[PDB]
Ligand binder design. Structure first.
Ligand SMILES: [Mg+2]
Ligand SMILES: [Mg+2]
Ligand SMILES: [Mg+2]
Ligand SMILES: [Mg+2]
Ligand SMILES: [Mg+2]
Ligand SMILES: [Mg+2]
Ligand SMILES: [Mg+2]
Ligand SMILES: [Mg+2]
Ligand SMILES: [Mg+2]
Ligand SMILES: [Mg+2]
Ligand SMILES: [Mg+2]
Ligand SMILES: [Mg+2]
Ligand SMILES: [Mg+2]
Ligand SMILES: [Mg+2]
Ligand SMILES: [Mg+2]
Ligand SMILES: [Mg+2]
Ligand SMILES: [Mg+2]
Ligand SMILES: [Mg+2]
Ligand SMILES: [Mg+2]
Ligand SMILES: [Mg+2]
Ligand SMILES: [Mg+2]
Ligand SMILES: [Mg+2]
Ligand SMILES: [Mg+2]
Ligand SMILES: [Mg+2]
Ligand SMILES: [Mg+2]
Ligand SMILES: [Mg+2]
Ligand SMILES: [Mg+2]
Ligand SMILES: [Mg+2]
Ligand SMILES: [Mg+2]
Ligand SMILES: [Mg+2]
Ligand SMILES: [Mg+2]
Ligand SMILES: [Mg+2]
Ligand SMILES: [Mg+2]
Ligand SMILES: [Mg+2]
Ligand SMILES: [Mg+2]
Ligand SMILES: [Mg+2]
Ligand SMILES: [Mg+2]
Ligand SMILES: [Mg+2]
Ligand SMILES: [Mg+2]
Ligand SMILES: [Mg+2]
Ligand SMILES: [Mg+2]
Ligand SMILES: [Mg+2]
Ligand SMILES: [Mg+2]
Ligand SMILES: [Mg+2]
Ligand SMILES: [Mg+2]
Ligand SMILES: [Mg+2]
Ligand SMILES: [Mg+2]
Ligand SMILES: [Mg+2]
Ligand SMILES: [Mg+2]
Ligand SMILES: [Mg+2]
Ligand SMILES: [Mg+2]
Ligand SMILES: [Mg+2]
Ligand SMILES: [Mg+2]
Ligand SMILES: [Mg+2]
Ligand SMILES: [Mg+2]
Ligand SMILES: [Mg+2]
Ligand SMILES: [Mg+2]
Ligand SMILES: [Mg+2]
Ligand SMILES: [Mg+2]
Ligand SMILES: [Mg+2]
Ligand SMILES: [Mg+2]
Ligand SMILES: [Mg+2]
Ligand SMILES: [Mg+2]
Ligand SMILES: [Mg+2]
Ligand SMILES: [Mg+2]
Ligand SMILES: [Mg+2]
Ligand SMILES: [Mg+2]
Ligand SMILES: [Mg+2]
Ligand SMILES: [Mg+2]
Ligand SMILES: [Mg+2]
Ligand SMILES: [Mg+2]
Ligand SMILES: [Mg+2]
Ligand SMILES: [Mg+2]
Ligand SMILES: [Mg+2]
Ligand SMILES: [Mg+2]
Ligand SMILES: [Mg+2]
Ligand SMILES: [Mg+2]
Ligand SMILES: [Mg+2]
Ligand SMILES: [Mg+2]
Ligand SMILES: [Mg+2]
Ligand SMILES: [Mg+2]
Ligand SMILES: [Mg+2]
Ligand SMILES: [Mg+2]
Ligand SMILES: [Mg+2]
Ligand SMILES: [Mg+2]
Ligand SMILES: [Mg+2]
Ligand SMILES: [Mg+2]
Ligand SMILES: [Mg+2]
Ligand SMILES: [Mg+2]
Ligand SMILES: [Mg+2]
Ligand SMILES: [Mg+2]
Ligand SMILES: [Mg+2]
Ligand SMILES: [Mg+2]
Ligand SMILES: [Mg+2]
Ligand SMILES: [Mg+2]
Ligand SMILES: [Mg+2]
Ligand SMILES: [Mg+2]
Ligand SMILES: [Mg+2]
Ligand SMILES: [Mg+2]
Ligand SMILES: [Mg+2]
Ligand SMILES: [Mg+2]
Ligand SMILES: [Mg+2]
Ligand SMILES: [Mg+2]
Ligand SMILES: [Mg+2]
Ligand SMILES: [Mg+2]
Ligand SMILES: [Mg+2]
Ligand SMILES: [Mg+2]
Ligand SMILES: [Mg+2]
Ligand SMILES: [Mg+2]
Ligand SMILES: [Mg+2]
Ligand SMILES: [Mg+2]
Ligand SMILES: [Mg+2]
Ligand SMILES: [Mg+2]
Ligand SMILES: [Mg+2]
Ligand SMILES: [Mg+2]
Ligand SMILES: [Mg+2]
Ligand SMILES: [Mg+2]
Ligand SMILES: [Mg+2]
Ligand SMILES: [Mg+2]
Ligand SMILES: [Mg+2]
Ligand SMILES: [Mg+2]
Ligand SMILES: [Mg+2]
Ligand SMILES: [Mg+2]
Lengths: 386, 197
RNA sequence: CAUUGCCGCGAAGCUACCAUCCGCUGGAUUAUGGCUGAACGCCUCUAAGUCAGAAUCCAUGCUAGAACGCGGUGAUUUCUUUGCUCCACACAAUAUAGAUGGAUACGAAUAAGGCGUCCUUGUGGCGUCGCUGAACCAUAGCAGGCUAGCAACGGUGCACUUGGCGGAAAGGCCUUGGGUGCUUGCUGGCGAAUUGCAAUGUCAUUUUGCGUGGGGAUAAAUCAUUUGUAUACGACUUAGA
RNA sequence: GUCAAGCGUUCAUAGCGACAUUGCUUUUUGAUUCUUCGAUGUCGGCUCUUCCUAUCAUACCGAAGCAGAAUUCGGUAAGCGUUGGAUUGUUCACCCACUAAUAGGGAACGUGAGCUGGGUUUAGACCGUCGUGAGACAGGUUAGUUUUACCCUACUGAUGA
RNA sequence: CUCACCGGCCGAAUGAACUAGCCCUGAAAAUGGAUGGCGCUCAAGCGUGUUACCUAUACUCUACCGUCAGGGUUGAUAUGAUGCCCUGACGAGUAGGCAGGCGUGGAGGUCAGUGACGAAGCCUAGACCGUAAGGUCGGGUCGAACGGCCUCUAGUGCAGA
RNA sequence: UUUUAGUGGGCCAUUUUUGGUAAGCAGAACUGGCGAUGCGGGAUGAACCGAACGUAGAGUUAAGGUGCCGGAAUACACGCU
RNA sequence: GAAAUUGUUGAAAGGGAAGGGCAUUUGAUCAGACAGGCCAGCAUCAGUUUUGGUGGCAGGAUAAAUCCAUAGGAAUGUAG
């Protein structure tokens, strides 16, 4: 007979299976639609999640009750050193889908990206791309034939970039290598842009602009095996229940004489690939810019880093992206920022954000001071040796 | 009688082609079918689209990954129609289905090879004029096939190349027919005409 | 010590509509309303054709990725009981969903076309063809031997080579020239027997190995230790001459 | 559903609709006794999933005795929702509210090695009626042990030649 | 301004009431699903007609096995008379009946049977005979007894309880 | 003519019937079946159609079929949808 | 010193059981003959069948038709 009372489903069946993602670097499964009138640009960028802070800004929302007043907003800071362009990849359209025709690599690759090709770098003779590097050596005619194949064929051009994870306060030293689509004009001109940018760096300023809605693609934080109560948000069973409370009581009817796929079960929670959309960029901060964290309204000489550093991350010495709100993944994680796949005209986009203040107190406690100068001015002088 | 037979599937009815191809496969003939997006099904498009959605409705209720696998491409619709005309769970029918290749468009090697028709299965020979019919590329696009535009682009390219082939082939058969006409009214050619040749 | 003795605060981590953030836009349609319009000289949303149109459907997008679906790319081990790869030819063993003259390439229409020719270059004129591949090409020679001329400068096999086109899986197609044979286009000479009146009477193409002689290259992965963005254990993500 | 006497200020058919009559369903209750008595765990609730459409709401429409507003009839449509409580073990009911709406059903009258055990249906006890009595009562009342998965599949995750 | 009516307008069929074939409406259920499936539309649908073809343990013919019947067969039946031969028909089977056989322990008789130069037992995708119950042989292992035939006898044959 | 086993729960179909709104319901009549029975066909099935069975061989058939699964005409013909 | 059950070696096969029946391939293994055994082919026959070609007859309205002659007639009317 029927359920006797209606309730909606627990959980979303479009995020199935709730398994561990295949890599720590989430895949960009769609790129923006190419307009061949625009100049050649990267559709995406790579960065690392440093952590969050909070801001104050005025609101430009006519009709809102909080129009032209201040609001406190959480912002996620993604540390974005410039990417190094090392390869190009050609893709032809086939009746079975998109197919990589060939890849052309740059002549010199750093040990950062070479270390990606090794499980055991410390024992290795480090032979990667040693015979490839001797195809540029005579005149590069074997490289120009492959680039001519990419120009002749290849309706889609993607570019290989890697992160500079040494510019980044992590103990990893092995770069993340990714394929970013080249949007813009003329497949030939895409190949020319990529060959010009071989061994070069693309900064996040020349890809992303302020007040841009972007998408974050990241693998979420892992939690291991989880019961159904937190994995799907089902109701807990009463206190009187024998054999445990943290369970789904009925896991099926007698017929179909099988547990159905829509029934909620214990399993892996987190470390899933997520693409979250429409996060607005609030600051594209330069790295060679003292006063990363100053605004036009504050002008206190301070960087984006909190006192004591970002917790578990470290300092930011690089360019960063201050994006509004929450994005998947935890701190230290590689995250791919992508352009918006559609043109949004929703009045929460197209709002020009001007920060009034960025919080830089310690996240390692309940911080009280924004700068050590403020701390010294409040507390006076202590016992600590001069 | 050929080592493989290449059927141009354009203007063919899907069941009347699939039963013929199923019998050729089981009798030991290797069959490759091309231009499966140009196949026909009799009856109107909304008729056959409701038939596909009725098929699309049925799946295993406890696990949709073990259900009937609703394959969307026109070559796969032809393959599904031709399974069920073959005992495909036996080793003999598995070996028969290994003799069949079905493609959308005409890709390589087969684009420089002779394509045949099966006149038992031709729509213009079987359907009464006025009877509506469905094109399998349009039906596949409606039920979720992604590659109708790519196949059309490649088929336009292939037809431009094939017409440049055929212009040279007519230019050669002009000369060959004229040179055979010069050898006519000779004592060897009248001798051959006395024997039906 | 009081099975964390108790009380206040308490970082970190986890967590809460008890906190924040974010949750896309195109196509085809249903009902229905229409257009043109016959049947039925009128009319008519319908019969042929056609427009719009729903929280629908299918895409876009989002999750997983076939552990027997696929692609691209990097490196590929000798001073290591001389290992690895490629090329060629000698012999073995495995087999074979089944060689036995050739899978012989327009596209479109089918109440229409193909071919040839001509002009005004068209949705043209004229002629011709179909009524099946019952075709076309190929096909003579000890499973095809040895040899002599005639005519022609054609045809064809194999390697060498020039140039070009082909990415849907191109892995093929078209060429330029020189060798190198053969030629049944025509006319001759020699041989075949006894496989004893038939007994596929063995002539195909994949895997491999091993032998010989000719090139080529000179690595990684895993355990163990380590990390914690990970985690029941595996696995994952890091580090280490 | 058909037919349409009649109602609907005139007007059969906007909405209805008598006397008749044709069906569908299997969520009611009977009818039967085919399966199970070397046992298929017997009510309700809780939890949780899916399915149906005879659509309450939401989307788009057609009709009205549709001026507006609010309604009513009908179409496509099950995409998405369909509540919080008082009393009762209840199913059902009834009321207070809130809501866009608080539609109807199925899945062994879904679901007990998922729970719970209020009810019913063992053994204790009381009452009323019946019975001479022992005792009876689909009459009332109160108390009354809820066992086992580590196997196979299925499912959820996790490795892997 | 509206009608039964008409012509300088046209240019050959038209109207009404029915009858019944197919199709459509009436036609709504619950896991996803069933002309058996795939599919199929001058069909691979419906109605009908004519031929060809396919194939049952059925029919025809022949062989062999059994059974039953009806016969033949004695003066070397050119030595097997519940024997041999001829002719014909027939052959499903639970419960059940009857017959002819196979096998096991023990007893009387016989083969002046087998055996430490290897009895019995046991193992053997080795062989032979029998429709079968079974019987026989070869090889391995083994170490003391055991077979055939004619009869007698029973505590005589196992997959289940 | 003697002797003796098993059985003494039946069930289905056509036709004729009774009770019941009806039932794969309950109860009778006649025959044929299943039980007790395989085989070919009806996809599947105790009972329907066909046909009942020693072991084989060849031929022809029944019922049912002949697009393909699947042996056998994508037969021929007149229409209807 | 049997079986169940197990180890090792050998052989073989293995996409959601395995096992079995008919038939053959392949592999393994095994019995046998001539002093005519096996397996075949051809011819001429016999038995049972299947598929063709072709000859001569019989019947019916002693086919009906066509054809030939003759009479009459029309129209989907030929020439004038
Ligand atoms: Mg409900
Ligand atoms: Mg709901
Ligand atoms: Mg939900
Ligand atoms: Mg639910
Ligand atoms: Mg994993
Ligand atoms: Mg993944
Ligand atoms: Mg390392
Ligand atoms: Mg290289
Ligand atoms: Mg946790
Ligand atoms: Mg939990
Ligand atoms: Mg949450
Ligand atoms: Mg709750
Ligand atoms: Mg709770
Ligand atoms: Mg309890
Ligand atoms: Mg159960
Ligand atoms: Mg679970
Ligand atoms: Mg679990
Ligand atoms: Mg903190
Ligand atoms: Mg089938
Ligand atoms: Mg061709
Ligand atoms: Mg599509
Ligand atoms: Mg999809
Ligand atoms: Mg002490
Ligand atoms: Mg103590
Ligand atoms: Mg203490
Ligand atoms: Mg206290
Ligand atoms: Mg959480
Ligand atoms: Mg989008
Ligand atoms: Mg319409
Ligand atoms: Mg219309
Ligand atoms: Mg129409
Ligand atoms: Mg029109
Ligand atoms: Mg439209
Ligand atoms: Mg894979
Ligand atoms: Mg490789
Ligand atoms: Mg012409
Ligand atoms: Mg012309
Ligand atoms: Mg390609
Ligand atoms: Mg020759
Ligand atoms: Mg962690
Ligand atoms: Mg761990
Ligand atoms: Mg009705
Ligand atoms: Mg009225
Ligand atoms: Mg029992
Ligand atoms: Mg149970
Ligand atoms: Mg409805
Ligand atoms: Mg409605
Ligand atoms: Mg709404
Ligand atoms: Mg739903
Ligand atoms: Mg819903
Ligand atoms: Mg209450
Ligand atoms: Mg209460
Ligand atoms: Mg009830
Ligand atoms: Mg309200
Ligand atoms: Mg039900
Ligand atoms: Mg039920
Ligand atoms: Mg129950
Ligand atoms: Mg129940
Ligand atoms: Mg229950
Ligand atoms: Mg139950
Ligand atoms: Mg249960
Ligand atoms: Mg319980
Ligand atoms: Mg219960
Ligand atoms: Mg109780
Ligand atoms: Mg007692
Ligand atoms: Mg009691
Ligand atoms: Mg009393
Ligand atoms: Mg009394
Ligand atoms: Mg009680
Ligand atoms: Mg008590
Ligand atoms: Mg219980
Ligand atoms: Mg279990
Ligand atoms: Mg355990
Ligand atoms: Mg399991
Ligand atoms: Mg009618
Ligand atoms: Mg079906
Ligand atoms: Mg079925
Ligand atoms: Mg069927
Ligand atoms: Mg059919
Ligand atoms: Mg018929
Ligand atoms: Mg026959
Ligand atoms: Mg027979
Ligand atoms: Mg005999
Ligand atoms: Mg008989
Ligand atoms: Mg008998
Ligand atoms: Mg006997
Ligand atoms: Mg005894
Ligand atoms: Mg004895
Ligand atoms: Mg004695
Ligand atoms: Mg001795
Ligand atoms: Mg012995
Ligand atoms: Mg013994
Ligand atoms: Mg044995
Ligand atoms: Mg032995
Ligand atoms: Mg001894
Ligand atoms: Mg002894
Ligand atoms: Mg002895
Ligand atoms: Mg005994
Ligand atoms: Mg006994
Ligand atoms: Mg027995
Ligand atoms: Mg027994
Ligand atoms: Mg026993
Ligand atoms: Mg008796
Ligand atoms: Mg009885
Ligand atoms: Mg009865
Ligand atoms: Mg009985
Ligand atoms: Mg019978
Ligand atoms: Mg039948
Ligand atoms: Mg049958
Ligand atoms: Mg049936
Ligand atoms: Mg009969
Ligand atoms: Mg029989
Ligand atoms: Mg056949
Ligand atoms: Mg011993
Ligand atoms: Mg044993
Ligand atoms: Mg044993
Ligand atoms: Mg053991
Ligand atoms: Mg073992
Ligand atoms: Mg498996
Ligand atoms: Mg052999
Ligand atoms: Mg023998
Ligand atoms: Mg022999
Ligand atoms: Mg003869």
């Amino acid at each position: 007979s029927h359920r006797k009372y209606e309730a909606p489903r627990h959980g979303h069946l479009g995020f199935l299976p709730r398994k561990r993602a295949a890599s720590i670097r989430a895949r960009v499964k769609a790129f923006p639609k190419d307009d061949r009138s625009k100049p050649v640009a990267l559709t995406s960028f790579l960065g690392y999640k440093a952590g969050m802070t909070t801001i104050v800004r005025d609101l430009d929302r006519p009709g809102s009750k909080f129009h032209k007043r201040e609001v406190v907003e959480a912002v996620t800071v993604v540390d974005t050193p410039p990417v190094v362009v090392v390869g190009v990849v050609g893709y032809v359209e086939t009746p079975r889908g998109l197919r990589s025709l060939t890849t052309v690599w740059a002549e010199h690759l750093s040990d950062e990206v070479k270390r990606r090709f090794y499980k055991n770098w410390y024992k290795s003779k480090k032979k990667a791309f040693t015979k490839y590097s001797a195809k540029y050596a005579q005149d590069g005619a074997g490289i120009e034939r492959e680039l001519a194949r990419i120009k002749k064929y290849a309706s889609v051009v993607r570019v290989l970039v890697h992160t500079q994870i040494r510019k980044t306060p992590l103990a990893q030293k092995k770069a993340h290598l990714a394929e970013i689509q080249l949007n813009g004009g003329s497949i030939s001109e895409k190949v020319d842009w990529a060959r010009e940018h071989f061994e070069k760096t693309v900064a996040v300023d020349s890809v992303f602009e302020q007040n841009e809605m972007i998408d974050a693609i990241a693998v979420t934080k892992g939690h291991g095996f989880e019961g159904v109560t937190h994995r799907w948000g089902t109701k807990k069973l009463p206190r009187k229940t024998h054999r445990g409370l943290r369970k789904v009581a009925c896991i099926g009817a007698w017929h179909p004489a099988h547990v159905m796929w829509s029934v909620a079960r214990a399993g892996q929670r987190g470390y899933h690939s997520r693409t979250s959309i429409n996060h607005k960029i609030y600051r594209v901060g330069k790295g060679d810019d003292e006063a990363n964290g100053a605004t036009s309204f504050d002008r206190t000489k301070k960087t984006i880093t909190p006192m004591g550093g970002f917790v578990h991350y470290g300092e930011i010495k690089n360019d960063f992206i201050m994006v509004k709100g929450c994005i998947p993944g935890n701190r230290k994680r590689i995250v791919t920022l992508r352009k918006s796949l559609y043109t949004n005209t929703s009045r929460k986009a197209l709002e020009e954000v001007s920060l009034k203040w960025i919080d830089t107190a310690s996240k390692f406690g309940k911080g009280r001071f924004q700068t050590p100068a403020e701390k010294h001015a409040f507390m006076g002088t202590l016992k600590k040796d001069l | 009688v050929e080592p493989v037979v290449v059927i141009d599937g354009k203007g063919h009815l899907v069941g009347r082609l699939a039963s013929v191809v199923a019998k050729q496969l089981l009798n030991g003939q290797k069959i490759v079918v091309v231009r499966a997006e140009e196949l026909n099904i009799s009856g109107e498009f909304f008729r056959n689209k409701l038939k596909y959605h009725d098929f699309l409705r049925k799946a295993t209720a406890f696990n949709k990954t073990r259900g009937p696998f609703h394959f969307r491409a026109p070559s796969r619709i032809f393959y599904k129609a031709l399974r069920g005309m073959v005992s495909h769970k036996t080793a003999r029918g598995k070996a028969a289905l290994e003799r069949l290749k079905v493609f959308e468009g005409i890709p390589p090697p087969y684009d420089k090879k002779k394509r045949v028709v099966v006149p038992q299965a031709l729509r213009v020979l079987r359907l009464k004029p006025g009877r509506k019919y469905t094109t399998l590329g349009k039906l596949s696009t409606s039920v979720g096939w992604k590659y109708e535009d790519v196949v059309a682009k490649l088929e336009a390219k292939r037809k431009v190349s094939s017409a440049e082939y055929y212009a040279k082939k007519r230019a050669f058969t002009k000369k060959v027919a004229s040179a055979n006409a010069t050898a006519a009214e000779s004592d060897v050619a009248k001798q051959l005409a006395a024997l039906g040749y």
